[PDB]
């Protein structure tokens, strides 16, 4: 993952120009079990998958 305010794709001639690069949506969340300890009351336990957005 690369952070940049310019609307320039990383696959340009200046970069390596290899691999598949696509624009991302939303923030990045590390894989973890939500509400494992039941710390937050009234919070349903969510199922999170890798690269899964919902």
């Amino acid at each position: 993952y690369r952070i940049g305010s310019y609307y320039i794709t990383e696959e340009d001639i200046n970069p390596g120009d290899s691999i598949s690069l696509g624009f991302g949506s939303w923030a990045k969340v590390t894989g973890v079990i939500m509400g494992t300890g039941v710390v937050n009351p009234d919070g349903s336990v969510p199922n999170a998958q890798r690269v899964e957005f919902q």
Binding site: R2, I3, G4, S5, Y6, I8, D12, N14, P15
Partner: protein, 53 residues
């Protein structure tokens, strides 16, 4: 120079120079100890990560 290379005296596999070669004029290729800095200039500063990254 004869005395210096006499200290080596082991010229069998080409040169095997033991000097320093502290000379370089100009190029966009080979670099001095600033290799790490110049790479992250070209890869990030103006190539991939635009201003405000």
């Amino acid at each position: 120079t004869f005395k210096i290379m006499s200290e080596k005296l082991k010229f069998t596999g080409d040169a095997m120079d033991v000097g320093g070669l502290m000379i370089k004029n100009v190029t966009p290729g080979t670099g001095d100890k600033d290799v790490v800095t110049k790479g992250q200039m070209e890869a990030f500063m103006k190539n991939w990560m635009e201003n405000k990254l």
